[model samples]
Target: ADAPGDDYVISAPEGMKAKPKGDKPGALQKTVPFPHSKHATVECAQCHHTLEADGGAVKKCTTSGCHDSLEFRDKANAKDIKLVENAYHTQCIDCHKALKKDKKPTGPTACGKCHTTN
Candidate 1:
């Protein structure tokens, strides 16, 4: 009924990097570590919005042609699905904030904290 056979590192999608901020060239917060099993209690379809039904298979984020574009489109075109960076960032923060409100072990809200050096 799930894909959680074990813990996983959401590695790869190599070209994914932090955006440069301010006028001068800013430092990169590169490399993010996601704790998958920790969110095991979450409903599958909650994050995987494309999943209309449970009978079909679960696909990888970018490779599946869902979040394939990493262009950070914002509200540019409503027709286009959110890119990898945008998609993940939105979902992660939303859930993490909710968890924090309940006084649980909250996830990182800031950029460096989430993409902390490993």
Candidate 2:
């Protein structure tokens, strides 16, 4: 079991498989490698919004209880909450953009900048 303060990757080692939608045809199905350690300084709740209620190591962002799919939207069950792909794009890119705006070092917000072989 994970401790309440333990840091963990919300994505997978092989990266999460995601289908492309809107303005990016022929995109790779895999997501960029996400490193929890890289964002270790970020507030846990920044991504794991349920950290407080969980009272333990927060679950992955894709947990059925969170932003997994549209089916759980406005529902009262452990099902989809939002499209997983859109959730990542919006949250990750928006955060990165904000950091850039503040003149702080940050990660890539573009596809190729992140989805590289390295």
Candidate 3:
């Protein structure tokens, strides 16, 4: 039932999840290891915001065919919300920024901080 553990690792070409974490095709960036173990303590729906009825994990964020672009449009007037880059930036950075605002442990939001050479 979506149990959380410390078995996660950020593999190259494939990050914490199944999708590639690079900014563009063939321009691969260093993958940053994510701590899903701690994140697992959070509700599955936090990341898996939407899922199938069978309760199976949905596709990765970028490959979901839902958020595969790099534009951020107004939700109320926009026909679709398929900005992959925008989605990731907003979701991840916003969360981390909020955590930092609250003086809580969080992840990096800067480009180099995450896409490091190490």
Candidate 4:
């Protein structure tokens, strides 16, 4: 029912769903591996926002109704949040910052550490 003491190697979406226009890769991210073992130790709701006390299943963050876009901002979009990357960046980065502020054991606050490059 939980991460069995290991990391989670999350490969990105299939080529970010292709790029015919470029014909060559841009500065694309190499990977987004996660410390699922460490993260899962926390309360499940901390990550799975859709999970409720009723034992609902953990849902994906990329469903159309949720954080589905790479776009950071859109005036027409009604939701306060619209970006998948931003959603993760904001939450993850801020959590580290909070832990740092509390002078408690924490991970890197720098974006470059977790968001590794090619």
Candidate 5:
């Protein structure tokens, strides 16, 4: 059972998996390694928009339709997992772009940030 306030947990030590091999293989997009400790101050709804109504600790941005197949999940094929690159590009890059446009302190907006062996 989930409490009133708890950061979403992946449970699996590796986080979300794309199930394919690539330069950014098996990565979970929108993850941003989203540091809950830092963003916990922000409205939980910002990321987990469905929290207040449908509460759960495993809230997923993919299921929430934030990426909409433009990033991590499949766009053309409903069953397929979108490329890890796509996920990072659509969500992380998009967020970074928005932050920079708004003149906020931004995170890395590059391939390295999106793709890492470690």
Candidate 6:
């Protein structure tokens, strides 16, 4: 179960339930050097797209009607569906761009800033 009021995350692998929240290494046995806290404010669903706004149905993070059913040791097409790196960049960066347009403090929109291990 979740905490007192906040919604809770299902216990599973890092990117198992929800897409790996923060800057994670590429698939396989990779890890993030920095803490997920850095991107805490960002919604996981922006990339994961599992739960609905009011917590409704689960949708495919990539294309509709598709789920990441396989894993890969290398960066392959099979891994693409499971990878939130693309979806996150599209949604999160767009939102951040809008926030910047509105003059709000935002996170990085660059690939290196996001994908790099730094």
Cα lDDT tens digits, model 3, 1-118, are: 5443554443232332223335543444565556676565566777667666436765566664566544334445255556544555576688889999999988898876866555
Give the range where candidate 2 is weakest over 10 consecutive residues by summed lDDT: 5-14
Q: Write the per-residue lDDT of candidate 6 for residues 27-48, one digit (tens) a residue.
A: 3323223334545676655444
Winner by TM-score: 4
Give the lDDT of residue 60 in candidate 1: 71
lDDT of 4: 0.62
Error of 1 at 39 (Å): 1.0
The residue-by-residue lDDT of candidate 4 on 1-118, one tens digit each, is 5553444554444424322334763454555667766675578777777788437776566666776664433445435575655576677778879989999877767656776645
Tell me the TM-score of each prediction against the true structure: 0.64, 0.62, 0.59, 0.68, 0.46, 0.39
lDDT of 6: 0.45
Instruction: Give the top-scoring candidate (lDDT).
Output: 1
| Positional deviation of residue 69's Cα in model 1 after best superposition, in angstroms | 1.3
- The C-alpha RMSD of each candidate to the native structure, in angstroms, is 3.9, 6.7, 6.8, 4.4, 6.7, 8.9
Q: Show model 5 residue runs off by greater than 4 Å.
A: 1-32, 56-58, 62-90
Give the clashing residue pairs of candidate 1, or none: none
Q: On residues 7-110, what C-alpha lDDT tens digit does candidate 2 reach at each position?
A: 32234323344334545533343336667667778876877777788885757666675765533122353333365656676778888999999999999977
What C-alpha lDDT, on a 0 to 100 scale, does residue 50 get in candidate 6?
55
For model 1 the local lDDT of residue 118 reads 49
Could you give candidate 5's per-residue lDDT for residues 1-118 as a string of tens digits? 3223333332222344464555656644333344456454456566555676665554554543443343334446544434434543565578778888899987667755634333
Q: Cα deviation of 36 in candidate 6 (Å)? A: 5.5
In candidate 6, clashing pairs total 0
Model 3, backbone clash pairs (residues 3+ apart or across chains), number:
0
Error of 3 at 61 (Å): 1.3
C-alpha lDDT of candidate 2 relative to the true structure:
0.60
Scanning candidate 4 in windows of ten residues, the lowest lDDT window is: 12-21
